[PDB]
Amino acid sequence: MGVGLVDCHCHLSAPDFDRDLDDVLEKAKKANVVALVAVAEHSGEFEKIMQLSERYNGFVLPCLGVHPVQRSVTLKDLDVALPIIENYKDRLLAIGEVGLDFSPRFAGTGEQKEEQRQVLIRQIQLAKRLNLPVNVHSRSAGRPTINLLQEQGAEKVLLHAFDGRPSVAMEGVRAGYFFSIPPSIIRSGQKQKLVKQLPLTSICLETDSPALGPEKQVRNEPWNISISAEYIAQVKGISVEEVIEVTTQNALKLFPKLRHLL
Amino acid sequence: GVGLVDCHCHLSAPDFDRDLDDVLEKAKKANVVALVAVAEHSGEFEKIMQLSERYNGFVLPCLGVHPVQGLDQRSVTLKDLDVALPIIENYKDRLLAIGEVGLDFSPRFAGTGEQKEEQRQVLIRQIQLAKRLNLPVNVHSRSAGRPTINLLQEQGAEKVLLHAFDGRPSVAMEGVRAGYFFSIPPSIIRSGQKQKLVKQLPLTSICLETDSPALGPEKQVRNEPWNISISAEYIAQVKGISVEEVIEVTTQNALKLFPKLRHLL
Ligand code: NI
Ligand code: NI
Ligand SMILES: [Zn+2]
Ligand SMILES: [Zn+2]
Ligand SMILES: [Zn+2]
Ligand SMILES: [Zn+2]
């Protein structure tokens, strides 16, 4: 009868959870959260993610990769990360937060934009070789990211917390890409216009814990995945159980290793 | 869909003074169809009533005097209820229930037998007031589960909500047989006591609450009415049923417990 909730994108290894991660994780189980997809940002926390993956086996699923922001990412940042990913290739659910961030502060220079582009292209190629999906960031770079993903022939893709127009998002739905919705949708008008247009067959749930919570500058936790489910249910004029059943089914399609690893 | 009801919360609390409208707009987006705002002291009755006018049909007001007073805490007095009575009488027709009444037999506040009887008398009068105005009671029962449930039975209370019942399931079963309702706050995911409670508790007797700003998923972290889905999620998993079944039944139970609700929405 009852179905579980999947957090397709979160940062459990973040310094914000160092103090109470186990209490947070036990409470998430009680809050009907069946699986957590833990993503990486830098190579320095890959061991910590793989350690959480072993301690909470079948509940915390790992993702390793180098994020566009580190300062903009460099090829040198990806070089350090490649031997570690290769060592855990069989244990990963996806390539853990890769993408582009064309924010004025981080990437203003054309060289910085190409460095990001190069680091993403290699990780799309790495993912294709290891037969793994990509868990993607695209802040202020929605069309650049989607085009690059199409060009590189990415099959299983998650566009997490899509900070872009619905016309750009429609390019992704046609490309067969998935979109995760964080609980910050209840305070964000941009995320509101997005879900409106987005078909439920292409929607997944995320928190992006410790970020993108219901309140700005207040720590976000994986149990807030129900807030996302509630917002989508009301906006789509359907049952919350329908949202929970379809988004969890979408998570199983997007991440093919999930059904077995759960 | 059906919508979620927060059967017990403190929107008038000083914790919400800065961003209440942002909190309430955010709660609407989070599929919260109704909020039942309760009182603690007469000094915030005007604030609760003004809020219910501003958010008409969404914020449902409850007025009453809580067993604990002050903000160093002390036990309630008959004088505290006397100041309240003229204000409740002025808003009798606009209220959904008598707003957080009950007993608190914590060692710090009601140690003395006289303090325990002062609380008992303040509650008894409010049950009498509620019976006259034909209103339900929204009840507190910290460390006084059986004393509250017996007193309510003795006084012949018809529509009762035992909010965040902190007592044993055997004591709670006395309430279900008496036809009383029990609201569950999102602190259930961190509280073992409330975990054994819902286990035994029939869903036909369960309601949802947050008790905002208190009893959140995290201790010493502000609780907001959108956390009512966390409560619904916990109950669904434990009962091995659909979250929509919990949302539909608890809202239906809220409409039975509060007879003015269907009309006031
Ligand atoms: Ni927190
Ligand atoms: Ni807060
Ligand atoms: Zn991101
Ligand atoms: Zn992220
Ligand atoms: Zn209380
Ligand atoms: Zn209360």
What secondary structure, in 3-state letters, does chain A show? CCCCEEEEEECCCCHHHCCCHHHHHHHHHHCCEEEEEECCCCHHHHHHHHHHHHHCCCCEEEEECCCCECCECCHHHHHHHHHHHHHHHHHCCEEEEEECCCCCCCCCCHHHHHHHHHHHHHHHHHHHHHCCCEEEECCCCHHHHHHHHHHCCCCCEEEECCCCCHHHHHHHHHCCCEEEECHHHHCCHHHHHHHHHCCHHHEEECCCCCCCCCCCCCCCCHHHHHHHHHHHHHHHCCCHHHHHHHHHHHHHHHCCCHHHHC
Query: In chain B, what are the domains?
Result: 1-265 (3.20.20.140)
Cβ neighbors of B203 (< 8 A, separation 6 or more) are: B235, B239, B241, B245, B246, B249, B250
The token pair that represents B140 in the structure block:
């507190």
Of B233, B207, B197, B217, whose CA–CA distance to B34 is shortest? B207
Q: Structure tokens of A125?
A: 């190629």
Tokens in use for A111? 């060289």
Distance of alpha carbon A196 from alpha carbon A79, whole angstroms: 40
Tokens of A46: 């890959």
Cα–Cα dist B154/B16, whole Å: 37
**Nearest residue on chain B to A219, alpha-carbon basis:** B221
Q: Do A244 and B243 touch (CB under 8 A)?
A: yes
Task: State whether residue B234 sits within 8 Å of chain A by CB.
Answer: yes
Instruction: Give the residue from A38, A42, A48 showing the smallest Cα distance to A11.
Output: A38
Q: Which positions of A make up the binding site for Zn(2+)?
A: 9, 11, 97, 137, 160, 208
Q: Which residue of B has its CA nearest to A20?
A: B218
Q: How was this model experimentally determined?
A: X-ray
**Spatial distance between the Cα atoms of A140 and A148, rounded to a whole number of angstroms:** 14
**Any binding-site annotation on B8?**
yes
Q: What is the dihedral of CA A168, A174, A178, A180, to 10 degrees?
A: 30
A206 CA: distance to closest CA in chain B (Å): 15
Contact A131, A178 (CB under 8 A): no
Whether B241 has its CB under 8 Å from any CB of chain A: the answer is yes
Answer whether A186's CB lies under 8 Å from B30's CB: yes
Residue B69, C-beta contacts closer than 8 angstroms, at least 6 positions apart = B40, B41, B75, B76, B77, B80
Whether A30 contacts chain B with CB within 8 A = yes
In sequence order, what are the beta bridge partners of A203? A179
* CA–CA distances in Å: residue B92 to residues B36, B132, B135, B182: 16, 10, 9, 24
Question: Any CB–CB contact under 8 A between B26 and chain A?
Answer: yes
- Environment class of residue B260 by beta-carbon count within 10 Å: exposed (0-12), middle (13-18) or buried (19+)? middle
d(CA B137, CA B129): 10
Measured in degrees and rounded to the nearest 5, phi and psi for residue B100 equal 60, 95
Give the tokens for residue B21: 């409208």
Phi and psi torsions of A134, nearest 5°: -115, 135
Residue A25: which residues within 8 A CB-CB, separation 6 or more? Answer: A12, A36, A56, A59, A60, A222
Which three-class secondary structure state does DSSP give residue B77?
coil
- Rounded Cα distance, A260 and A131, in Å: 15
What is the C-alpha to C-alpha distance for residues A146 and A154, in angstroms, rounded to an integer?
10
The CA distances from residue A261 to A57, A122, B116, B184, in Å, are 8, 26, 56, 33
Residue whose entry in the numeric block shows the structure tokens 């590189």: A152
Q: A29-39 b/e with 16+ CB inside 10 Å = b? A: bbbbbbbbbbb
* Per-residue tokens: A6: 């999947």
Distances, alpha carbon B231 to alpha carbons A122, A228, A255, in Å: 44, 15, 29
Distance from residue A90's CA to the centre of ligand 3 (Å): 24
Q: Considering only CB atoms, which chain A residues are within 8 Å of B244?
A: 239-242
Tokens 């149990």 sit at which residue? A223
Q: How far is CA B203 from the centre of its chain?
A: 17
A209 contact residues in B (CB cutoff 8 A): none
**Beta pairing class for B97-104 and B137-142:** parallel
Query: If you measure from the C-alpha of residue B216 to the centroid of ligand 6, how many angstroms do you get, rounded to a whole number?
Result: 12
How is residue B27 written in tokens?
Answer: 């709660």
Burial degree of A122 (CB within 10 A; 0-12, 13-18, 19+): middle
Q: Answer yes or no: are the C-beta atoms of A84 and A46 closer than 8 Å.
A: yes
Which residue among A4, A223, A239 places its CB closest to the CB of B244? A239
**Residue closest to B140 by CA, chosen among B111, B182, B109:** B182
Judged by CB atoms closer than 8 Å, whether chains meet at B1 and A240 is answered as yes
Q: Could you check whether the bond before residue B213 is cis, i.e. omega within 30 degrees of 0? A: yes
A17 alpha carbon to ligand 1 midpoint, in Å? 10
DSSP B220-236: TS---GGGHHHHHHHHH
Residues forming beta bridges with residue B183, ordered by sequence position: B163, B207
User: Contact at 8 Å (CB) between A134 and A119?
Assistant: no
- Are residues A241 and B242, on separate chains, in Cβ contact within 8 Å? yes
DSSP secondary structure letter of residue B108: T
Q: For the purposes of burial, counting CB atoms within 10 Å of the CB of A218, is it exposed (0-12), middle (13-18) or buried (19 or more)? A: exposed
Give backbone dihedrals phi and psi of B60, rounded to 5 degrees, phi first: -105, 120
Asked if residues B101 and B66 have their Cβ atoms less than 8 Å apart, the reply is yes
What is the distance between the alpha carbons of residues A156 and B2, in angstroms, rounded to a whole number?
35
Give the span between the Cα atoms of A32 and B186, in whole angstroms. 12
User: Do B38 and B99 contact (CB within 8 A), yes or no?
Assistant: yes
Residue B168 and residue B4: Cα distance in Å, rounded? 26
SS3 B29: helix
Q: Are strands B32-37 and B59-63 parallel, antiparallel or unpaired?
A: parallel
Output the CA torsion A86→A92→A96→A98 (10° steps): 50
Of B30, B237, B240, the CB nearest to A230: B30
* Residues in the annotated binding site of A: 9, 11, 97, 137, 160, 208
Kindly report whether the peptide bond that precedes residue B14 is cis, defined as omega within 30 degrees of 0. Answer: no
Which of B200, B124, B228 is closest to A227 using CA atoms? B228
- B214 interfacial to chain A (CB closer than 8 Å): no
Neighbours of A167 (CB within 10 A): 10
CA atoms within 13 A on the CB side of A96: 32
Pick A2's closest partner by Cβ from B26, B30, B240.
B240
What is the chain B residue with the closest CA to A1? B241
Closest partner CB to B240 (pick from A1, A27, A231): A1
**Single-letter amino acid, residue A174:** R
Contact B31 A241 (CB under 8 A): no
Q: Three-state SS for B265?
A: coil
For A2, which residue in chain B has the nearest alpha carbon? B242
Asked if the C-beta of A84 comes within 8 angstroms of chain B's C-beta atoms, the answer is no
* Nearest by Cα to A158 from A59, A10, A28: A10
What are A204's two structure tokens? 């997944």
Alpha helices in chain B (DSSP H): 20-29, 45-54, 78-91, 113-133, 145-154, 169-177, 192-200, 228-239, 243-257, 261-264
Place of tokens 């009840």: B139
Residue contact B243–A238, C-beta within 8 A: no
From B210, B150, B151, B158, select the one nearest B180 (Cα to Cα). Answer: B158
Note the maximum CA span of chain B: 50
Question: Is the Cβ–Cβ distance between B60 and B35 less than 8 Å?
Answer: yes
Residues near ion ligand 5 (CB < 5 Å) are B 140
Phi, psi torsion values for B160, nearest 5 degrees: -135, 140
Kindly list the residues from chain A whose CB atom is less than 8 angstroms away from the CB atom of residue B185.
Answer: none
DSSP 8-state secondary structure symbol assigned to residue B43:
G
> What is the C-alpha to C-alpha distance for residues B11 and B49, in angstroms, rounded to an integer?
11
CA–CA gap between residue A93 and residue A258 (Å, rounded): 7
Q: Does B15 touch chain A (CB under 8 A)?
A: no
